[PDB]
Amino acid sequence: KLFETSPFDPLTIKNNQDVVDKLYATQSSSIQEVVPTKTFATELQFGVTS
Amino acid sequence: EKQKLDKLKLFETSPFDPLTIKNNQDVVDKLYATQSSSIQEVVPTKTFATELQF
Amino acid sequence: ELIKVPTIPHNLVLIQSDNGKHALIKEDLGQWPVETGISLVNQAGVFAVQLANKLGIDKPFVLDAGSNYFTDTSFIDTRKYCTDGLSPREIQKALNRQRAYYDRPELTISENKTLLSQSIIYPDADGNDVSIIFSGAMSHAIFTYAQSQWNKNIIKLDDYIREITLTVPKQYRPRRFKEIEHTHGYVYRELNQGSLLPLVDANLKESSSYYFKKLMSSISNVPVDARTLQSATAALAADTGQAVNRAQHVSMLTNRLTTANAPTVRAITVLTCMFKQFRIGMTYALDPNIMDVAAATCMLLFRPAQSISDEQYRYCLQTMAVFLTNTTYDIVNNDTIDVLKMKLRNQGWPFVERYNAVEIDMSVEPLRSPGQVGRYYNPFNIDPLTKKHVEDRLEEFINQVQVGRFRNASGNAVGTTLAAFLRACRDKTSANWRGYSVLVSRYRSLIPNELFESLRNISGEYNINPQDEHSFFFALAQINADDEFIGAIDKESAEYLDEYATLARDISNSLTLVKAAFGPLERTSGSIINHANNLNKVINHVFADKPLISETMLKILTIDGTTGKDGYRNWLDKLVGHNYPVYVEPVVNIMNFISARFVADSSYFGYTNEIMIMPNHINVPVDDRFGFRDSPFCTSLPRTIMGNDVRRISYNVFSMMEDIDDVISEGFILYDAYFNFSYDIMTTDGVTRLKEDILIVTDTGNDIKPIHFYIYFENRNDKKLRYESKMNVSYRLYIKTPACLLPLSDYMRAQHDYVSPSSSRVYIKDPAVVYTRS
Amino acid sequence: VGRYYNPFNIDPLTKKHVEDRLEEFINQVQVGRFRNASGNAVGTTLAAFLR
Amino acid sequence: CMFKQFRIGMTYALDPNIMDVAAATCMLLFRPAQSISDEQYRYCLQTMAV
Numbered sequence: 004k005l006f007e008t009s010p011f012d013p014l015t016i017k018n019n020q021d022v023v024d025k026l027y028a029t030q031s032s033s034i035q036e037v038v039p040t041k042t043f044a045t046e047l048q049f050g051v052t053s
Numbered sequence: 054e055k056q057k058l059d060k061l062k063l064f065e066t067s068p069f070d071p072l073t074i075k076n077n078q079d080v081v082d083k084l085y086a087t088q089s090s091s092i093q094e095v096v097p098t099k100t101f102a103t104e105l106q107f
Numbered sequence: 108e109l110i111k112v113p114t115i116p117h118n119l120v121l122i123q124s125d126n127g128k129h130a131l132i133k134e135d136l137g138q139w140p141v142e143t144g145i146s147l148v149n150q151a152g153v154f155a156v157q158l159a160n161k162l163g164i165d166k167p168f169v170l171d172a173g174s175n176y177f178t179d180t181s182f183i184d185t186r187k188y189c190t191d192g193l194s195p196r197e198i199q200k201a202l203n204r205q206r207a208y209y210d211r212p213e214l215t216i217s218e219n220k221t222l223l224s225q226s227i228i229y230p231d232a233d234g235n236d237v238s239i240i241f242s243g244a245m246s247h248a249i250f251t252y253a254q255s256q257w258n259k260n261i262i263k264l265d266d267y268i269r270e271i272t273l274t275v276p277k278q279y280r281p282r283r284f285k286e287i288e289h290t291h292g293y294v295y296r297e298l299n300q301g302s303l304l305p306l307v308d309a310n311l312k313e314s315s316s317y318y319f320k321k322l323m324s325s326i327s328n329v330p331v332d333a334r335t336l337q338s339a340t341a342a343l344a345a346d347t348g349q350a351v352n353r354a355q356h357v358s359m360l361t362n363r364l365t366t367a368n369a370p371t372v373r374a375i376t377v378l379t380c381m382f383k384q385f386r387i388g389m390t391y392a393l394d395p396n397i398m399d400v401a402a403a404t405c406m407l408l409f410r411p412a413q414s415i416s417d418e419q420y421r422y423c424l425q426t427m428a429v430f431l432t433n434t435t436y437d438i439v440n441n442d443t444i445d446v447l448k449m450k451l452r453n454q455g456w457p458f459v460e461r462y463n464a465v466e467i468d469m470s471v472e473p474l475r476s477p478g479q480v481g482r483y484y485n486p487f488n489i490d491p492l493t494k495k496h497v498e499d500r501l502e503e504f505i506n507q508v509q510v511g512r513f514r515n516a517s518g519n520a521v522g523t524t525l526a527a528f529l530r531a532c533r534d535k536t537s538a539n540w541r542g543y544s545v546l547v548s549r550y551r552s553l554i555p556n557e558l559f560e561s562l563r564n565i566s567g568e569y570n571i572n573p574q575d576e577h578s579f580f581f582a583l584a585q586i587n588a589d590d591e592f593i594g595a596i597d598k599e600s601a602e603y604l605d606e607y608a609t610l611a612r613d614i615s616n617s618l619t620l621v622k623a624a625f626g627p628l629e630r631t632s633g634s635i636i637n638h639a640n641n642l643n644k645v646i647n648h649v650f651a652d653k654p655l656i657s658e659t660m661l662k663i664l665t666i667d668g669t670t671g672k673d674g675y676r677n678w679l680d681k682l683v684g685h686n687y688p689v690y691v692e693p694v695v696n697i698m699n700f701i702s703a704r705f706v707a708d709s710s711y712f713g714y715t716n717e718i719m720i721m722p723n724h725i726n727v728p729v730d731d732r733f734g735f736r737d738s739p740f741c742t743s744l745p746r747t748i749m750g751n752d753v754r755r756i757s758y759n760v761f762s763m764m765e766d767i768d769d770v771i772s773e774g775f776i777l778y779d780a781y782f783n784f785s786y787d788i789m790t791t792d793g794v795t796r797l798k799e800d801i802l803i804v805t806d807t808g809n810d811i812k813p814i815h816f817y818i819y820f821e822n823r824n825d826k827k828l829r830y831e832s833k834m835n836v837s838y839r840l841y842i843k844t845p846a847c848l849l850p851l852s853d854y855m856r857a858q859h860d861y862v863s864p865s866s867s868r869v870y871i872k873d874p875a876v877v878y879t880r881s
Numbered sequence: 882v883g884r885y886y887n888p889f890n891i892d893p894l895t896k897k898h899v900e901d902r903l904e905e906f907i908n909q910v911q912v913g914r915f916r917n918a919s920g921n922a923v924g925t926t927l928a929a930f931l932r
Numbered sequence: 933c934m935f936k937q938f939r940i941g942m943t944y945a946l947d948p949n950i951m952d953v954a955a956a957t958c959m960l961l962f963r964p965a966q967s968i969s970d971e972q973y974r975y976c977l978q979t980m981a982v
Contacts, residue, residue, distance in 0.1 A: 019868075019869045020869055023288065035283075037283050037878060040881070041878070041879045042875035043597065043877050044875050045275060045875075046271045046274060047604050048299065048608050049297070049608045049609060049611070050297040050612070050692050051616055051692050051694060051695070052694065053165035053166065053698075
């Protein structure tokens with residue numbers, strides 16, 4: 004078997020967002036270069052609203 | 054729980070410890086009263102000594 | 108978060124008669140009541156906000172109408188027929204009925220294929236999808252303009268990462284991105300930075316107090332490792348000659364060493380080393396003693412020169428000279444800095460100089476300071492390169508103090524005591540400067556450059572007592588950075604980022620409001636009255652319902668003690684007639700576009716600017732394209748009728764009139780007002796007449812009643828209707844033809860194109876490029 | 882027609898005090914020492930009241 | 933070890949602890965020099981220096 008857990012089922016996805024989300028869900032079952040944690044923001048601006 | 058915190062803060066609110074307080078008090082206690090009147094005229098009073106050393 | 112709009116918001120409505128002879132297409136944008144005597148641009152903007160809300164345009168969005176298509180049954184036709192807009196089936200049915208009236212044959216097969224394939228979706232060169240559909244002109248223009256304005260802020264992920272690459276600190280862990288988010292990642296972020304300097308400059312002490320309070324509440328909880336106070340006291344007592352039987356100066360120094368307020372002094376030190384100019388002063392006792400000299404020496408030696416002001420320097424020198432030089436306060440009241448320095452140096456005291464701290468540049472860019480380099484002062488006047496005090500003769504000066512004679516010709520009690528105390532303080536600072544430097548750097552990373560250069564301590568709330576200063580320098584603690592402290596600091600960094608952004612947005616909104624509302628002020632009364640009334644109206648309106656201003660801004664304005672409305676009112680008044688630059692955001696451009704089109708094309712929104720009233724017995728050229736019977740629409744208002752110019756009257760003059768019968772016996776064009784009107788196009792045939800009378804005469808004045816046309820279609824051979832129109836109606840009202848009305852025959856002008864971006868784009872909600880360490 | 886003095890010496894055009902150095906004067910009072918031999922915190926109290 | 937192109941990186945705290953220096957030395961000794969980047973090498977030296 005190539006994979007212990009498949010990265011995703013090819014039939015379930017319908018667009019690129021779906022495959023990105025499936026990768027983000029399944030990444031815990033693979034060796035990760037950087038284990039995810041809280042993200043840190045350095046630049047953030049709010050535009051004026053209607 | 055507040056009593057323990059207060060007792061602990063007593064250590065840091067002053068540079069003395071009960072050991073040093075006892076040592077200092079062992080020096081001026083009964084010193085002024087024991088001496089004669091003439092010597093009493095030329096030595097500090099007990100309250101004065103406590104004020105100086107504390 | 109971008110909103111994907113699944114359908115194009117067309118507003119085409121097909122109206123056809125029961126006979127089917129006539130048909131037309133109309134744009135429905137609604138009727139908006141417009142007033143007169145007030146400015147039109149303000150009402151235009153007020154209506155433009157609602158119009159944008161109606162079209163799903165106001166909020167940021169992207170178009171996702173590419174997938175709304177089907178394919179024909181025929182095998183040659185591979186074209187993608189779009190399902191949006193006015194469906195070609197409706198136009199086909201209307202045209203078939205129109206040809207059924209005229210006894211013409213129905214549309215052929217070839218014509219049906221030509222018509223039903225008009226609305227189509229085709230790919231574009233770069234991958235976008237262009238959909239051609241039947242839609243109105245106003246909706247098309249507004250939607251396309253809004254699409255462009257919002258597209259101005261969508262940028263690829265790599266470009267955003269490049270833009271924010273300078274500000275990423277070294278210690279945090281880089282965030283891996285999926286390959287799709289690199290090849291096809293797009294982010295919607297505003298990249299213009301709003302200056303916070305208006306608020307900081309206008310009310311300096313409120314902002315300074317707020318930021319200082321938050322920073323010190325943060326700093327006060329830093330864990331430290333400190334030597335026991337009793338141990339240090341024992342060491343100092345052994346160093347000098349300290350005995351309990353005899354009163355001495357060392358006893359006075361070591362009788363009031365308190366560590367209770369150590370965190371406050373620690374936070375004050377961090378604040379002094381963090382900002383560009385943060386003054387601190389001490390008030391010594393009326394009769395100075397050795398504690399005051401120790402504290403003054405500590406301030407002069409280890410506090411930064413920028414922190415000490417010239418008056419504070421003079422006061423410290425005066426106290427030192429009073430203690431050590433056999434003099435009183437009244438002697439040195441008129442003395443200057445040079446005289447005090449010479450007096451203290453003549454007696455042998457060398458600690459009479461201020462010392463400038465040494466700046467260290469931050470590794471990464473300060474936040475909200477594009478293209479700038481930040482710096483902070485190193486604590487305790489220690490040069491990072493040499494790892495010692497800036498003064499290179501400090502040991503020699505301490506030895507000089509040791510061998511000198513102060514307050515007594517014979518005996519070195521004061522000199523020895525002060526030398527021992529200063530040596531202990533110097534050792535503590537030299538050992539512990541590193542942790543304080545690290546803490547100062549980190550807490551400096553939280554404030555931008557505008558706050559670094561602008562914030563000042565003017566309230567004098569944060570002072571240090573002399574006892575606290577000498578105790579803090581004698582028993583200096585070693586700053587220890589734990590993991591929990593770093594995590595809390597990260598949380599506060601996020602909080603500060605959010606609060607800075609909210610402050611910038613609030614400042615921009617306030618600048619826009621103060622530019623749009625209040626004009627110049629004058630020395631004349633009545634102008635002051637008008638300004639006060641307008642200010643009260645503005646404050647009351649902005650604070651009602653959801654407050655315009657954020658809660659953090661209300662907090663920083665209130666911190667003085669005002670009610671929140673008063674502080675905002677004062678700040679708004681202070682901003683009148685500013686020169687601060689402002690940025691035109693996409694939403695402002697969209698509203699301006701919609702308001703300009705509202706002002707220009709008045710017929711689309713149910714109001715005109717001139718009307719005409721003339722008797723039924725005078726023939727009038729009319730727009731006969733639609734086929735209405737006695738159509739109240741003219742292509743343009745007649746300049747000349749029956750060889751003579753048509754009289755024009757302003758609404759005010761017309762209302763003021765008293766001989767309206769004579770002037771109405773001929774008919775006239777009313778102008779200088781915005782006439783609101785409405786119409787109900789009925790499918791059947793009938794007399795075209797208004798719901799109400801044209802005119803109302805009162806002893807006060809004359810008015811024009813609301814206009815509601817009942818439009819009916821026309822059958823030429825109808826004696827009853829012709830006679831009723833000729834005889835029953837005596838006067839008629841004519842307005843310019845609405846631009847939303849459009850015949851069915853020229854339907855090809857309703858064809859319009861909308862472009863939607865490629866479906867392969869993936870959108871990143873959190874464009875952060877780095878992960879927290881733990 | 883008539884003329885009256887603007888209360889509190891505020892110019893409507895400047896929308897501030899007539900003196901263009903009030904903030905500098907107030908800080909000068911705040912950081913100054915007035916009666917060193919007798920009394921304390923005179924300057925700070927006066928500065929707070931003035932502000 | 934198997935793949936030469938794969939690299940190893942490590943991030944230290946703002947104030948290094950004796951654990952951080954221990955990891956820095958352990959990385960420079962018992963890991964291939966080909967799998968340690970020059971920038972990561974400078975970071976480890978800087979951590980040892982501070």
